């Protein structure tokens, strides 16, 4: 209990880090389809 | 390839996202 | 869409950035 | 003592880094993509 | 505390960690996303 | 600069693997 402003703050920082992430996912998402619509222009 | 790996990250996740709330409920029960 | 994507991004990261901070901060006062 | 979030955190720890590094696999393979594109388009 | 400082420690250096490899997966998204605008300029 | 961004993402990847089994070896030595 003696360190439980930094365990809040880990905790926080892991949401933080799993919503980049999920953002990130989206937008590479995006780019999959780029690279798809791309390649079917082409062949 | 590609369609296993969006798969396997979306996987990953949801998983992530359940110990999320996992670990904030788990916080909670120290006063937060 | 990319845009609002990447500005979202940017502004989470930095959010990450000053949490970060935060808490090595704090894991030096627990020290 | 929290044992028991500090598992949540460390097991958590490893759900994000594993997620992390499927998508770098997922990253390298648009980046050849485009490469191959880059091939073929100029 | 004072049991679990080194876990402790260890989280966080995990989480820099994280977050430094995520920032550097951004910049190679924001390359592979105007590598695409790119192509689309030469093909769209 | 895309090459070197890769290497930069696999070195960090891997220090992160070498930490997550060092912090899973001290979450045990936390038991009794």
Do not use: D, F, P, Y
Request: net charge neutral; glycine share 2%; proline share 0%.
């Amino acid at each position: 209990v003696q360190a439980r402003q930094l365990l809040s703050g880990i905790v926080q920082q892991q949401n933080n880090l799993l919503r980049a992430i999920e953002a990130q996912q989206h937008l590479l998402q995006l780019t999959v389809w780029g690279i798809k619509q791309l390649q079917a222009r082409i062949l | 390839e590609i369609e296993e790996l969006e798969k396997k990250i979306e996987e990953l996740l949801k998983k992530a996202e359940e110990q999320q709330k996992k670990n904030e409920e788990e916080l909670k029960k120290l006063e937060k």
